[PDB]
Amino acid sequence: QGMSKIFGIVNITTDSFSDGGLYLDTDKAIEHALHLVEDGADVIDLGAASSNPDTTEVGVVEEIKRLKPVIKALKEKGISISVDTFKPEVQSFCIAAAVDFINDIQGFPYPEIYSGLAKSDCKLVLMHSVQRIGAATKVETNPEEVFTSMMEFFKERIAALVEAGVKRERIILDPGMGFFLGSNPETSILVLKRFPEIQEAFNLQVMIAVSRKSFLGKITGTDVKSRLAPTLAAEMYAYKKGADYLRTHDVKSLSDALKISKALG
Amino acid sequence: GMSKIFGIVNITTDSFSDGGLYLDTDKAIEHALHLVEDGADVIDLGAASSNPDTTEVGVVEEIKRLKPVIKALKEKGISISVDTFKPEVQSFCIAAAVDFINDIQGFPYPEIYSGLAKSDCKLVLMHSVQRIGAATKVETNPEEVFTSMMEFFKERIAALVEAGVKRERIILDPGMGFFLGSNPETSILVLKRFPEIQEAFNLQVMIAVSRKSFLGKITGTDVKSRLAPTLAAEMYAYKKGADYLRTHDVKSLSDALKISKALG
Ligand SMILES: [Cl-]
Ligand SMILES: [Cl-]
Ligand SMILES: [Cl-]
């Protein structure tokens, strides 16, 4: 039967800095990516910057300098690559490298780039985000408001992309999780138990990305270093309900959870 | 619809004569307290010997190590289950009034059945494919292993309720992993059809799946020290209605059920 596809999270910056040698070493993140494929990652999700860009350097030229050797090495081994980036100039390079996915926390709001996205066979994952880059953190207090607004934001953005020429069945909808729904945990749970409505309402694939998000920690009172168990609980829940894609760090713990669950059924 | 966790606490001591028995039972208590804070409804006490074989001297030492931990725990008001198969040790448990007696041999000695009746301890009646006092041959094929233990419960329950034990005290553990043969399907079969135990006997079922090797057959990873493949199976049993879950990693369990309840 069906089975959620696993996006293996590989952040070049943290993987290159874990030694403490203050080295921008893509080699450490290439090997980490290869490990995730061995653990059973269907797609590798690349990240050359952080998603909350409070950080001092958001450079477009360096964000490409980091994805450059990793995409080269992974593409030669046949690895399905997904790059997570909000900068249109960085996504333009992703189109030029013919990566398999492009992950936009901003959901492609720059129509300058639409015509090129259409021509390329890149699958787009279209994330809804309640927050704005650079602005203060929003605590969206009304979960049902965030859910209906999320549905409106999709209905408009999908039609905008499809008018520009993007084939619609190459769009994946990520409703966002945790930070992207407001620091309110309950709205995170709401989206989790309501994402099948998104599939039915649009006949599109849906990606659920709950791994290690702080809302899990608030339900269990657990620290970030010990979120594996509440993570696996959530990823399993999304799987049984029909998630098309699951984004996670511990690909292998997730593979074990899915392998055990499919065998029991 | 909530499953109760059994926390596994092992009391270990070397082969030299005491002096410092306290700083081994004291950690077992510290371990059991930490397990309660991690969400353990019942502590499952284990006091197996160095050479796990019955002897008249090994019993008095197994009791010697169970005594201070049992006493310290139900001083704190914690529910106690004792994992032991030696009748003299079980008898001390009956007098200790522990909340559960977990016998891997399935109470195969009708000489003790009288004393089990004169108590309120719950009896975790456990099944095993290689059980004591059976004239039946061991079974190879899973669906036969299933119907075999289904009849084992039927008869072993009748022997207990006759002797004077109330059937409401008998929790059924069908056993898992090596206890059903080196055949992974057996434990898979039982893992999904164990609701058939509950309805056909009108009784609670314990599922003890944590860190069993058959999970490694399904997965291809190191289940003996890894969290996920165990937790994946424990969650399955929870949704299928398991009344009790025996587990080492209580914290991982407890939090995985907190998530599954918020998503209820
Ligand atoms: Cl709508
Ligand atoms: Cl392994
Ligand atoms: Cl490992």
Author numbering:
A (entry chain A): -1 to 263
B (entry chain C): 0 to 263
Question: Which text from the study accompanies this structure?
Answer:
The sulfonamides (sulfas) are the oldest class of antibacterial drugs and inhibit the bacterial dihydropteroate synthase (DHPS, encoded by folP), through chemical mimicry of its co-substrate p-aminobenzoic acid (pABA).
We determined the crystal structure of Sul1 in a ligand-bound state, and the Sul2 and Sul3 enzymes in both apo and ligand-bound forms to resolutions between 1.74 to 2.8 Å. In particular, loop 1 is oriented further away from the ligand-binding cleft in the apo structures of Sul2 and Sul3 as compared to the structures of these enzymes in 7,8-DHP or pABA-bound states. Similarly, loop 3 in Sul2 and Sul3 also undergoes a large conformational change upon binding of pABA or 7,8-DHP. Finally, in the Sul2 and Sul3 structures, loop 2 undergoes conformational changes in a more confined space in presence of the ligands.
